[PDB]
Subunit: 460 residues, 4 copies
């Protein structure tokens, strides 16, 4: 009565087909889903690459146009050190903004007004921020500071020199910023056969004095707002149709998997009832179907967001990419289920499955030692070692060391400071050698031993 | 009747010699083949190195001569950013072309005419390509584009300034190219005792505006056409003879191996016929002889191509090198057969052979997870990480991570973008840590376990 | 009588609670200790990061202000090679010191007098050191040297050119130094909500001729003396209270652990006495409590030093950081004790414990081979290889090689010297290949085997 | 009669002492030998470091003084590309040579005459080498060359401009060289308390045109001839005594070890004779004593060479360093013998010993595959990949790949050439992926398996 039903429920697709001759719709549906999801992700990535490259190339051009004495690879060290240098950089940026139409290799339009920091009819805002009251007398070890920040900002209209009278309050200066906007048209879209779209680049140039260290870093950042151009004309819809096909495939997969999960739950309820006459009742849950339902939800939501983005109604590229990428990862991981139907592959998959619990437990054991080392290295070596400045950076360095990467440079950075502090150098020697020896000779060896033991258990 | 024949067929060379005292011609033939094939490959590579160096040195000299403000290591970032910069670069290249006889350290001759892009009597072609109709008004978010490309190209005759009147259509410009040819004689051939040959370098300088990003990259490429000089004269054939010797050795090896394979097939047919009174019948096939026949074919074809190339009748160096290198690899791999005749080496070789099937199956299992990670990383991190821009690049990065290479720089690239997008940085942390942990603690451990299990099976 | 007491003594916390229902104060005390110690370390590190950054940024600004022709990344090669270059560098540094008020982006005050090398009223000391008697005649292979060093030093008062008359004794010059001090106020302290403190930077510029090689390296170092500003005023104590809480928690932990250790010792004495009617009697010692007592002592001492430092009465940041970091590492390592109470985690921890003795013995065996290789590589390759200049550097290089890091660059450095000395290049080939092969194929394999054997022993 | 003698012969030092109470002179002699040999090596290395640094610093100073437009890190790319550049470089070098007394920071004396290439009274030789007859007409694809090299060389006397009339035969130029010598005194010897010695630097500047590629590399090399200064005088022998002590210790060790080996041989002869009433008779040979005798010979010879060198009668630093380093390596490896006397260490050492034969056999099996890959990669990728230019470089790259080092850069170098040749890029993908997969997943796994099997054999 019930034993036959339970036996059918826990049977492989091939033997299920032999038993009842039903159509294996779900399996071919999953194959088609993998295909279409991968194709959609590839097309989306190819489309996004072009936009990313356009933005990056424009920003590099802006750095070469507006930053005085800029060269590639200098982003992290580009700074001013004298009052003359700072004035020259600021005035050069403003003059290049005013000369852009006659000098630039790109074609840019000016944007006026549109809220702060710009007044009406103003294209460029040159704003200096300094403390409301600042009296600093290091000679007398004295200071009187009101930390309230005051902004004083000059407005420059593009053509068709009040900024040259700028006077900086160096002793109380917090920062200087230059804000402007440039409109351009992405013609290289025609390479991919699309229609050009209209970009507005919001450019911010920052001269940062918040450290008050005598060194003022200079940076240029851009933010791109993309719109559909309002008058396209190119001499002489199969992308939304594919998105709809993807949505329908994922919807059908979700419905079939949900029906299977519901049937499994009903059978579990029947079994518990008949056994009245949780690790065991959760044996009725097909984890692969949980994974498939999750991937279907992620794909549908990401495809809706993609439709929005490609129509220019949305600009949340990161979230859409994360959803689509995670769903593609899950659907490809789901291919392991088909390999589990064959004995030779199932041996290896079962080995991994039976090893996983002890691997996780050993990871928990190793984590406390690893975290102790992280904290110690951060506190002791952070003042001296560039790779130990932040806790996340320390963790990345230690993790790379565990895997035998970037070891000699880590030792050499401390070598460069051996003469300064001998105690810190000796401590670094002990710290690095002990950590590496412990984690390579003993920890990774035990991971290998756990996997080998699981494999030997499976093979018998 | 037949059992004796089958026993003789499946016997080692030494015991075969004991049984019938026949001459082991094939074994010494294989030894000689390995020797001569390796010698030929070494000579060919030594000869190709000189030509490669000559071409590379000439091209570096051209970059220093013709690119304004060029310096070594700037190939990937060399670009123009202003109209003045572009004009200066173009005019500098043309002026250096015209001044070459009096300034260059090399000796070059001019080439005139000879088809497009050059007219008759013209040495240098300066061509600008722009859209047929281009109206771009980013101010009004408007554009009218006919994507048909128009080429307008100026011709410069070498001496024995109409180009100075060039006017670039910056808004519709697709690219600018400079084409010319230089003839030189490779005298350093005398270092290797050969006869100098005549090179024609086709030089192409590209100013690329296809991105329309305000940044125009500049590159110089060369193509070398090598000929026999028509009037050699050096004050005061044992290379083709060696090629013929190689061809004959490989032909004899091919014939002997083919005869052995035919005999094996005949014996298999006899055995099946007698067993009437495919994994078993393919046991009659000597795989080492399949490999030897393949290597003989590859060596003969590559040697024919090499004879053609060295006479200057062919220029397909890549295919010839691939054929000869693959054949040399195969003949060296064939030395394992001789080690299989000794018990202690055969133990290890048999271990590898019995492990291989499960290793391939586990590779198949690991491949789907790896590919899912590839797709996810490409879509999510490609906009932010230089190592994740293309799918092949993503695969290379992930493969290097599996083996503990370039890990910290991968983490640091994302560190550099933590402030921008926190969600993407957190995702990258999860992505990298999970991938590395999974593939190093569990996957490589299982490869080790598979090999160890195979070894323990062999030793019992 | 006694067996019950001994059984209670060697019981887990849960079963102890069942037996006597006593309060598990020590366990929750240890949890609280871990929490507060970690919080204190994080706060201390965040506070120290700001000061480190302030000092580093000021020093970089000084290098750009005072070193003629300095650029970032040139610290290790910055040098003078002509007499004119050296004079220009010295005079540029002094002129920039005199012009600092009108050119610097920072706000600095001059410091006068205050002991050597400065006289009263002098801000900058320009001192040249040369041998008392030096006659060097390489033409006649002759020299007469009195190695006693003479110091002649010019004093410059800051404003509100006797140094321009400096004449260097080039042939007998030992070095040149420029000493001065600058007072500044650390305003960026307000970012962390603290009160700005007063920094005195002692700047030393060295032109070093001790090698007498014709190349004089130039360096700039700073030493920061931090004080409480004597007239703070910022428009509109929960850090010392936390330190006191930490001290009290660690004191209570120390007392409870000491009481437990004393009770264990008394029980051991009773057991030996009753067994009259050291590896066994030390079984009565709880090693986790030894570790906890050590961590308590380190935390208390480090917290006292931290209280001193934050009040500006102490400047021993290195020792305080080492104490606090080591204590945090120990308290996090102590979490393993709680995992040992659960069978599945205890299996892995016990595996590590039983493997440790043989791991240490094998480390001892490997150490002599490693040290022999260190000495050989230092003596043979040190003259030619940058990574082999010092013994500690050699050890770092070899250790990185063992773990598969920085291998190809090590080979390439010797490749760059193959033409010079063929014998040394061949020796380096043998040396590197043999070391790497031995230590990767055999040594690490044996570490894996030891751990696997221990794991198999534990699982049975 | 004999069994007692054989039993005594094969006994440990402790049990030997119990049996006969003889003095263990050899063991303490070996301890003293290790100590003194290590001390000698350390002192020798510290002494050599100073001389190496002096030579390197002088050579860097020469590069900055004599090479026009030279900067650090440009050694490998420093070249001339125009006739004007080459003339300027040559004339700048000669002018700096003539101005050296008034410009250099070092103190140098001129050397005149003394054989070729200098005439009597000449300090600098400026020599150009070109073909005897050279007619190159690339326009007509014609050339008439007599490869005999003619040298024409101008002589410059130092002061107390015929070279300015140099005319270069650019079309037939082989190279240009500048030779001169400078005498200096190594004053920094006083830092180590030694006596300054007199250096003669032979400086060679080469402008190399042997490629005839239009790019002429420029290099500067030095050769240092060190002498004892003939008139030392420093205001106000325990190194040779230590060398004699080392020689005597090694002589005594050699004699005792030779006596033991002779006794072993005599006992073996007795045993074979009595067994009449080679793997077994070589069991009578103590391999540790063979090693000790070798190390004694190497140490004595190296110490003799060191005595010669330090007296300035010899200049063979490389051979002496190799001898002393190898001997120190051997004496430190000999410490394993003492660990073999203890069971727990002997287990691990015996594991390594019993694994070694199969490890060597597997290395032999792996070598043919590795060499096939080396040849294939050299021939196919050498034209395109910098890491594959020479066979030794290919081997170093592949060995580094086996150990997971420098993998991503190897892939990226080929990425940079994907557009050029797609066939070569695909081949490189297959080549690299297959090599790395094979050698990491299967070969290293089998090394681990061999060691684990040996360990399990030893433990039972
Ligand atoms: C009255 C119906 C009410 C429910 C409505 C929804 C019905 C619906 O989704 O059925 C899914 C199946 C295929 O679903 P599919 O997954 O291909 O097949 C099922 C699975 O193999 C399942 O095993 P697991 O996958 O391991 O859980 C098994 O237990 C079911 O048998 P069982 O029923 O005897 O237990 C199968 O029917 O059938 C269609 O797909 C109908 C196509 C119709 C024509 C389409 C247009 C031409
Ligand atoms: C009538 C003949 C028609 C066929 C013509 C071609 C004949 C031809 O290739 O024979 C190859 C053998 C050597 O060939 P070689 O490979 O050295 O030797 C054979 C292999 O050992 C083979 O074993 P596998 O290699 O394991 O398959 C074995 O079965 C054969 O014995 P079997 O015949 O009893 O079965 C051997 O003869 O003999 C010559 O090489 C003759 C030299 C002649 C003189 C050369 C100039 C001085
Ligand atoms: C007359 C007393 C003289 C000694 C004075 C110091 C007394 C002192 O430290 O006791 C520690 C314990 C808790 O200490 P705590 O560590 O939580 O608990 C002890 C441990 O569990 C110990 O095992 P191990 O940790 O494995 O060694 C066990 O043997 C002891 O039982 P036993 O005594 O039967 O052998 C327990 O009492 O009790 C308080 O903490 C009192 C709180 C009082 C109220 C506080 C304010 C509200
Ligand atoms: C008539 C003698 C002719 C031969 C002359 C040379 C004699 C010479 O080298 O003896 C070495 C031994 C110490 O040598 P040493 O190595 O310390 O000791 C020997 C080893 O232990 C050897 O074992 P292995 O090392 O395993 O082979 C063992 O067989 C010998 O016993 P056996 O003789 O019963 O077989 C020992 O004598 O004795 C001195 O060192 C004498 C010191 C004298 C005083 C020095 C100044 C105060
Ligand atoms: C039948 C249930 C077994 C678990 C399948 C889900 C595995 C997901 C891997 C991420
Ligand atoms: C006797 C047949 C066994 C297989 C030999 C071929 C192996 C080729 C390795 C690439």
């Amino acid at each position: 009565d019930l034993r036959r039903r339970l036996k059918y429920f826990f049977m492989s697709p091939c033997d299920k087909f032999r038993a009842k001759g039903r159509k294996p719709c779900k399996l071919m549906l999953q194959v088609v889903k993998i295909l279409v999801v991968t194709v959609q992700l590839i097309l989306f990535g190819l489309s996004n690459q072009l936009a990313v490259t356009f933005r990056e190339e424009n920003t590099i051009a802006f750095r070469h146009l507006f930053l005085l004495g800029y060269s590639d690879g200098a982003d992290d060290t580009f700074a001013a050190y004298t009052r003359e240098q700072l004035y020259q950089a600021i005035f050069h940026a403003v003059d290049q903004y005013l000369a852009l139409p006659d000098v630039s290799l790109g074609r840019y339009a000016y944007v006026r007004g549109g809220g702060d920091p710009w007044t009406n009819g103003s294209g460029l805002a040159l704003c200096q921020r300094y403390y409301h009251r600042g009296h600093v007398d290091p000679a007398n070890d004295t200071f009187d500071i009101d930390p309230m920040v005051v902004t004083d900002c000059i407005q420059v209209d593009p053509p068709e020199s009040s900024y040259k009278n700028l006077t900086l309050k160096f002793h109380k200066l917090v920062n200087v910023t230059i804000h402007f906007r440039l409109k351009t048209i992405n013609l290289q879209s025609l390479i991919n056969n699309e229609i050009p779209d209209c970009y507005t680049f919001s450019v911010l140039i920052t001269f940062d004095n918040k450290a008050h260290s005598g060194r003022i870093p200079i940076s240029l950042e851009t933010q791109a707002h993309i719109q559909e151009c309002k008058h396209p004309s190119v001499f002489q819809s199969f992308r939304l149709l594919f998105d709809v096909v993807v949505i329908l495939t994922c919807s059908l997969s979700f419905l079939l998997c949900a029906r299977s999960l519901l049937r499994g739950f009903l059978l579990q309820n029947e079994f518990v009832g008949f056994m009245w006459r949780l690790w065991e009742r959760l044996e009725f849950v097909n984890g692969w179907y949980i994974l498939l339902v999750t991937s279907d939800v992620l794909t549908i939501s990401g495809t809706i967001m993609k439709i929005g983005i490609e129509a220019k109604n949305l600009a949340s590229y990161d979230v859409c990419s994360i959803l689509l990428g995670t769903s593609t990862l899950l659907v490809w991981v789901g291919v392991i289920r088909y390999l589990t139907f064959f004995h030779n592959y199932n041996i290896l998959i079962a080995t991994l499955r039976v090893a996983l619990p002890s691997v996780m437990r050993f990871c928990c054991c190793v984590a406390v030692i690893y975290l102790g080392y992280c904290f110690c290295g951060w506190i002791v070596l952070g003042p001296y070692h560039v790779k130990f400045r932040s806790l996340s950076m320390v963790s990345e360095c230690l993790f790379s060391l565990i895997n035998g990467d970037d070891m000699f440079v880590t030792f050499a950075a401390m070598q460069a400071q051996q003469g300064r502090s001998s105690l810190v150098w000796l401590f670094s020697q002990l710290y690095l050698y002990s950590f590496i020896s412990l984690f390579i000779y003993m920890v990774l060896s035990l991971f290998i031993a756990l996997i080998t033991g699981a494999y030997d258990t499976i093979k018998h």
